[PDB]
Design a protein around this ligand. Structure first.
Ligand SMILES: Cc1cc2nc3c(=O)[nH]c(=O)nc-3n(C[C@H](O)[C@H](O)[C@H](O)COP(=O)(O)O)c2cc1C
Ligand SMILES: Cc1cc2nc3c(=O)[nH]c(=O)nc-3n(C[C@H](O)[C@H](O)[C@H](O)COP(=O)(O)O)c2cc1C
Ligand SMILES: [Cl-]
Ligand SMILES: [Cl-]
Lengths: 226, 226
């Protein structure tokens, strides 16, 4: 009896601490076969995945964490977040960041703690599987919708196996080093990553709540005309 | 007892013919509340939705389909699809297009049938609910990942209610006309639409299959270092 679609949606959260329980290769393959059944414009299936486990996962994570801790600034190819920050987006970002820091006992402005927490991103938060997503250079903006559809399918499918995830744009910061480490072909662009693994159930960062906007704040229902 | 997550993922298909059964506002709201639980970078939740039913849905479909049938060309404000078409993308697009046409009995050279079939997009394929998605002008690329995540959550949640969908970039063709008809504020951009409804299980266009790439075509598994 697998979990139901609604249970998958509601139980999915961003998990940032994992146990050392390994994920079988067969489970990873089945998750990705399910995700490949995401829709995409004219069935182009633009998603490309790199799966890191074992020694190479540890090497990549440790090398990228050291770039952060060494003070090497990120350099992204694309703009992910707003260039002009304003409300209500300001407050949404501020709340989840403050709630994460509170769970970890980090005071705002403690730069040493903030940096060490940031660096954990690049270890995929200690997950036993690290996923990186790339797309071909000829792809346009539609393919980013497609990629989000594919990634959410991974995240929901994972719940079917009792697995957890964290989507991670952090990796975009070090696309040049990732390209070097993994010999990523020049015609592919690294878009983002995702941690996959079994949650550390009692880690405090896995036990806070996130809000969402009430639907009438972002949905306009229309029926009448004129 | 809702369907399981895997059944939702695999049974989802792009449905292009619907019954005349309406969808309750309660069910639309439930679907959107579930979709709101998609993840987004820093919980920005950039998605905005316009839900069309009843008279206004009929009117939008009428106006936009008549633009197609009258010869009025689309003008998109973004590039959704590649500007340079190459293999393997070319074959993927051609195969789904040829299989749709085959299901419909549309032969090479049937220009009026092809125009008719294209125009059906703009009626949301006859669905009782039409969705349009917008995002704020300050949002950047990342928000397209987020919107994709949200949209696929709709599509999968819908299966839990016995409903079906078709994601549709087609509406981007007539963003100017949609903005005027629905008074979409100037700081929001129309990204794409989606049909929602009960599939017509007898319609031939709902009774073909789409391919997906085998996972070795696009997943690279790496474990060893070096
Ligand atoms: C972002 C996006 C835009 C799409 N645009 C259209 C569209 O305008 N009209 C249409 O009939 N199908 C559209 N499709 C549906 C795809 O053709 C379909 O997802 C693909 O061929 C795979 O088939 P499946 O969804 O049945 O698995 C779109 C799908 C996506 C994800
Ligand atoms: C595209 C995308 C990129 C994200 N990037 C990161 C990241 O780099 N690091 C991180 O800890 N969380 C990241 N997040 C997770 C979000 O912060 C999280 O989804 C949001 O706060 C809502 O919380 P939830 O996923 O627990 O519901 C990302 C999420 C998305 C969708
Ligand atoms: Cl950014
Ligand atoms: Cl386009």
């Amino acid at each position: 009896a697998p979990i139901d679609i609604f249970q998958s949606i509601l139980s999915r959260k961003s998990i940032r601490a994992f146990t050392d329980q390994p994920v079988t290769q067969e489970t990873i393959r089945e998750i990705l076969k399910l995700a490949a059944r995401a829709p995409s414009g004219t069935n182009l299936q633009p998603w490309q995945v790199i799966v890191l486990t074992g020694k190479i996962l540890q090497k990549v994570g440790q090398e990228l964490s050291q770039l952060v801790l060494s003070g090497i600034k990120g350099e992204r190819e694309y703009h992910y977040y707003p260039r002009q920050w304003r409300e209500p987006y300001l407050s949404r970002r501020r709340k989840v960041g403050l709630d994460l820091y509170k769970s970890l006992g980090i005071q705002k402005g403690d730069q040493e703690k903030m940096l060490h927490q940031k660096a954990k991103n690049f270890l995929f938060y200690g997950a036993p599987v690290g996923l990186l997503f790339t797309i071909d250079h000829d792809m346009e903006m539609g393919s980013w919708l497609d990629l989000g559809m594919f990634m959410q399918t991974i995240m929901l499918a994972a719940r079917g196996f009792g697995l957890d995830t964290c989507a991670q744009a952090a990796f975009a910061d070090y696309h040049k080093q990732i390209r070097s480490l993994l010999s990523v072909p020049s015609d592919r662009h690294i878009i983002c990553g995702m941690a996959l693994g079994y949650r550390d159930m009692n880690a405090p960062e896995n036990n806070f709540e996130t809000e969402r906007e009430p639907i009438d704040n972002f949905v306009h229902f229309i029926k009448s005309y004129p």
